[PDB]
Amino acid sequence: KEMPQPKTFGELKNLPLLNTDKPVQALMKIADELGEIFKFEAPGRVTRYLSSQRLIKEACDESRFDKNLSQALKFVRDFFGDGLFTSWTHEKNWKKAHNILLPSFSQQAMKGYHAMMVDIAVQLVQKWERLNADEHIEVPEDMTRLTLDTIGLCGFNYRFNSFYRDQPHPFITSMVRALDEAMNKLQRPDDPAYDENKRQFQEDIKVMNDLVDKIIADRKASQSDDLLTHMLNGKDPETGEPLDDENIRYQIITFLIAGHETTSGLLSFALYFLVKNPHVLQKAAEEAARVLVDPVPSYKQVKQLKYVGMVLNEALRLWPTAPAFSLYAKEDTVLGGEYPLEKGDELMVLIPQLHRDKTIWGDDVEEFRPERFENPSAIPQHAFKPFGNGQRACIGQQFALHEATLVLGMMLKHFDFEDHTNYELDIKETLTLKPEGFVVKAKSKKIPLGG
């Protein structure tokens, strides 16, 4: 079969289609127009975007396809190096770090993180309890305060102290501005008009490198048994080697960013869908009240929040917050009986489109129905992939879910929520997705919160 392709712009081919602040949303629209697969060409490159469970299931066969670094991940790699997210599977440091850090995401590990998660969650609740009448909440902003603080404390024993700030933490400001500068630069000339951009860039890289330095120095100065403990001391059972110093620095930056941005988006979209679906809200709120019987939640009680977990999975169905991942053909192969591929050919999996495959989910794919997740074996293999695929799947999945379940459960226990502005969904795309400008009012249920 000859592959569909979107509209062209002469020698630039399809490239100008991505000249938008919302490329993933643009690609979704193209997918709706063209179907389960389409080719996308730019000068010097080609990729094929996949949207159906039938094709994506084959792309997820690790004997045939491996993780690729898309253009986006190559760019991030200048900052995240050969950390876990931006390493190739065949680089020695991938499997070494995987094996060293996997234990940091065990059950015993999650039990160990729980107390510090509650520390940050209690700060969020107290914030909202302390608002005056008729004041509102800036949802993605507060969720990011929470999730940045949580990875800093749980992972690193570092306090970002984001609830003591009206502005973003300087580390995040410097990361975003360093990423932007790196991007604007390619598209420009050593005009001394750009000497100031270069000065700002050095200062932002310094902010990042100083934080990394400080995380490491504070630990050496200090018994912890957290993510940073395993980075600094753990040995790979296979090679017998620990991580090298440079790789440790890349892991710290990778985890600080990866370990919060997508989770903030998930909590934000979950609350959005709950306020837009009051009967679902009522069910989740009822579960929180019935389960969360103590002044602060226990690990076991978070595990008991089945419906809250279904809400979170449904939010990930509709708006998976790391919405695309890339693969390459390990050898020449034919995809779906129809599309020949050569060794090295790139594929992109459009997760939001996969999650709207009517042949899997039924016709009502735009509806928010947590109940889809009530009998989990009923979800076909490779139908639901918000955490990626195979050995290159999200290492932090359990950490994200535990944090989000805890936090959303506490939110629902302690407050009633109002969509006071009748908010119109506007999804901002960065490395992640978020509902930009989402605001609510939260009226306290006046339920005491433990220490």
Ligand code: HEM
């Ligand atoms: C709802 C939250 C999250 C979502 C939707 C998400 C999604 C993803 C996806 C789709 C990948 C695969 C990327 C690819 O194939 O290119 C991935 C990888 C990764 N994630 Fe997550 N993630 C979440 C939370 C986290 C958290 C909390 C952590 C850290 C504590 C984290 C750390 C990582 C790392 C290090 C990898 C690379 C794994 C490897 O290749 O060895 N993620 N995540």
